[model samples]
Target chain A: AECSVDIQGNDQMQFNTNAITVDKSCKQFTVNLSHPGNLPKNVMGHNMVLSTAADMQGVVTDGMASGLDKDYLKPDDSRVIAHTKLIGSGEKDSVTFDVSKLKEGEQYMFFCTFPGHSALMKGTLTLK
Target chain B: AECSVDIQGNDQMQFNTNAITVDKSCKQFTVNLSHPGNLPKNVMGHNMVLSTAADMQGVVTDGMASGLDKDYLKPDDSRVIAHTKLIGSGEKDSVTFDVSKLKEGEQYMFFCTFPGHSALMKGTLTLK
Candidate 1:
């Protein structure tokens, strides 16, 4: 069974997918993010951040303070379940986390934390 | 003719209007922004930034490094035609800049500089 998914981001403020399912039998889940547009990361950078919907706002709030060098995410932020590095066009990043960390029935959010990206580059992740 | 315009921002990730016109006879133009939603500035903070459409991407790229305290704008960025402070629900801010700085035939853009806001909170500003 596939244990990972590849996602794409572009200059038009979009992610190729908005939903992902992690098999409960898996020991880990992985997410791969790539930017296909030509814009530089500074202008249209992207990163994947995983957290509960309730934590999304707070994570974004603090991440803006951390800046793009930190991948637009707060350093050592305990609220983050998993995240990928900020990337521009032609770049890629990935992250994997133990599936045991996720609980069934909880709605989790997967989003790009790049400064205005969360507005449109967001998705939902569920365990099955 | 009015030399200024009022703009509104909301939690829905939008600016109430997509265009603003500045009178050439005026010495300055003003933009007032307000948020009516209940979210805190940290959760849904916003700010206005003015630049030519060509400069929009570069400005947003550097602004993400400045963080919320600086209103998400690079300090002393020469490309900025004008800007406003970042605000949250029940808050408002405004900016006024010399009308002479604008040139005819240039496509100007006004957008929220808070992290992901530019994606949906941008509009055109023209001198008439």
Candidate 2:
């Protein structure tokens, strides 16, 4: 709705949508993540992590060590543009990032830092 | 505390107590379960299921297919003497049963039937 997009993550460890498109005229883009499941956060958690396609593998690896308490992401990693707190059943979280972060020719991606989540909980972002 | 016992289930999928002793003079007995963890019931869940040691394997196998909404148990199964609803972190439940339900020569057991939980979340019950 509006300039923001609503995304849903379920117990199956997947996202409702697979791509995100940001309007170029918008000053900022918001990602709203609502997790629906009967599972627990420490296990089937989902979080919204935004970064360049090239940085996904790098960010995911480091986040695995950070663990569940850290929302499965490294702290203050520059490669990460924005992210939301990890969520479980009946949980909601959001992430907003400045439009200025987008590059002219680079591809951006959004994913969950949860250990097994990113493999399927992924989407693409673009400025258009 | 006269004829009651408090058991704790933690996030590690283990119960704090491995044995319970019930005084025979008591007309009825109670089992209280307090869960300590940040996980979810559909996954890392705990419950106090009472049955004969011989019937445990039968009940456990049938319940695994029943799914979470049913609390991972076959509804109204006569084999189960008593049981508490499945619970997650910070959750608590209690189950009480008549002493007459227990047999003198048969061995009774208590365990969680939440799939993998029964493997470690087990305890012994005896009348004296």
Candidate 3:
């Protein structure tokens, strides 16, 4: 019953926004993703996965091994608080997670799990 | 029956080998791809597609619009002589096509259609 925000990914391996602020009183948060480029998913696919900053590398490494069928993220990966399926250009996906997962003093990041792109496709998340 | 060779892609937006030579005696040719580094596919997927150098850009542009379900390739794209589905780290897929499809003096190239990669992933082909 909470409002959500949108993020756009392009073929250039970039995201439209660099941060997301969630309402502290809301019980849940949502992310809607869009890719406006015309590159194939394997080449320019984008998705948003939420995780603790410390767990980012490990989550990305294991997710690379999981392949596209797993949405390029490890199945049942506890490190991921939320995520959307991988999508190519002109595609979109939305994901929602409970805000209770965030605790005060902890930091989080949202990023595209497409292997090489994550180097430049990361953004911050704050529970307001 | 002619033997085939391997082509390796990596996390650095590069391939271990640049060009592949096919033995003229072999009626069929194959391309084997391997990504040794760990990176999620959505970020760094690898796949091979064969097409005339003239058709490259259009094919790539349209392929980008096709999404992951089409393997980022247009359905039944006449320009694509053959292609392999997108794969991530430590995973592999291969495709074989008859050499007869090639004509003397006409140039061809094999590349990865994962957006932006072909700018560096392209290599030449010769019938002989």
What are the DockQ scores of the candidates, in order?
Answer: 0.10, 0.06, 0.39
The window of 10 residues in a row where model 3 chain A has the poorest summed lDDT is A37-46
Question: Among all windows of ten consecutive residues in candidate 1 chain B, which has the lowest summed lDDT?
Answer: B36-45
Per-residue lDDT of model 3, residues B47-115, tens digit only: 888898899888888877776667678999999988988887788888888988877688788887776
Best by lDDT: 1
Best by DockQ: 3
lDDT of 1 by residue, A1-128 (tens): 38999889887779999999999999999888899966667657788999988899999878877755677789889989999888888999999899989999998999877655687889899999
Residue-level lDDT of model 2, residues B25-124, one tens digit each, is 9899999999876655754678899998999987887676576788889998889999999898789999888998886767889998875467667888
DockQ ranking, best first: 3, 1, 2
> Any runs in candidate 2 off by more than 4 Å, and if so which?
A1-128
Question: What C-alpha lDDT does candidate 2 achieve relative to the native structure?
Answer: 0.83
Candidate 2 per-residue lDDT, tens place, A1-128, comes to 75799999986567899888888888888999998766667656788999999999999878876877787899898999989998988999888889998966779999988764676789998888
Using TM-score as the measure, what is the rank order of every candidate, best first? 1, 3, 2
What fraction of the reference structure's interface contacts does model 3 contain? 0.85
Q: Candidate 1: where are CA atoms >4 Å away?
A: B6-119, B122-128
- In model 2 chain A, which range of ten residues has the least summed lDDT? A36-45
State the DockQ, from 0 to 1, for candidate 1.
0.10
For candidate 1, the per-residue lDDT at A80 reads: 95
lDDT of each: 0.85, 0.83, 0.81
